Scaffold this active site. Structure first.
Site: not given
Lengths: 199, 72
Positions: A91-93
């Site tokens: 994920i990329c948050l």
């Protein structure tokens, strides 16, 4: 045993179970290992989104410098989305990286990801291919996710058209998953995806 | 013996070949039958692109088997 606060995960674990979201059946959590360093989360695709109907699993691990460094989270169930690696679940948050905070609750993370499903963050992608398709053809993207949700997340109806194109390639003896990622990555172009498939 | 070559436009032909035949002459034969230059054909079998060097039996492709053609 270098896991600082095994007594928080426990509190935040109660918190999630006792939340209104869990009775509302939007999010839920489960333990995997004794020590309490790896949980298994599950969220529901938000309504009115290609993720609707889907039930997605998350790998939640807690590192040693926990409170301070955020917990590492991955999508177990295969999802097609700008902010989630279509082949690794990374994920990329902001909050799951640097913009993380002291008292960010697990419940805050599970809801955050759920919200993410309702509105991607294309400019800060994880998957270049998905983010691009999501911009140059927000319709295809949706139709493509509605499928992924179906084949992998147990969601209802999917495009009977795409199944047809997944058939023509699987005929040549390719692995299903591979076939799908190729067709989804090349704009569902039977010719240009069979291409990728051979590299 | 005969095998079948299937393209991605749906078309399906049945051409005479020899087990000993290499991959290139199968292409050669494909050329002779449909006019496509081997120079632009890629043959796929069971998710693999048969390399010009190995034969049909070399690959263990028994007669009546189906190969897939993907034009460059």
């Amino acid at each position: 045993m270098a896991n600082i606060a095994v007594q928080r995960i426990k509190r935040e674990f109660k918190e999630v179970l006792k939340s209104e979201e869990t009775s509302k059946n939007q999010i839920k959590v489960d333990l995997v290992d004794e020590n309490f360093t790896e949980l298994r989360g599950e969220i529901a695709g938000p309504p009115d989104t290609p993720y609707e109907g889907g039930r997605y699993q998350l790998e939640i691990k807690i590192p040693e410098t926990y409170p301070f460094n955020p917990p590492k989270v991955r999508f177990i169930t295969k999802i097609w989305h700008p902010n989630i690696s279509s082949v690794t679940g990374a994920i990329c948050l902001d909050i799951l990286k640097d913009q993380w905070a002291a008292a960010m609750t697990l419940r805050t993370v599970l809801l955050s990801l759920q919200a993410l499903l309702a509105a991607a963050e294309p400019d800060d992608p994880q998957d270049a291919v998905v983010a691009n398709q999501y911009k140059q053809n927000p319709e295809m993207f949706k139709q493509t996710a509605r499928l992924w949700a179906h084949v992998y997340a147990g969601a209802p109806v999917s495009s009977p058209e795409y199944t047809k194109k997944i058939e023509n390639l699987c005929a040549m003896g390719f692995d299903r998953n591979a076939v799908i990622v190729a067709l989804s990555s090349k704009s569902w172009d039977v010719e240009t995806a069979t291409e990728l498939l051979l590299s | 013996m005969q095998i079948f070559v299937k393209t991605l436009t749906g078309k399906t032909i049945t051409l005479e070949v020899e087990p000993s035949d290499t991959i290139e002459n199968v292409k050669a034969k494909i050329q002779d039958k449909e006019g496509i230059p081997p120079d632009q054909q890629r043959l796929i079998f069971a998710g693999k692109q048969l390399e010009d060097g190995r034969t049909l039996s070399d690959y263990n492709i028994q007669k009546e088997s189906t190969l897939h053609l993907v034009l460059r």
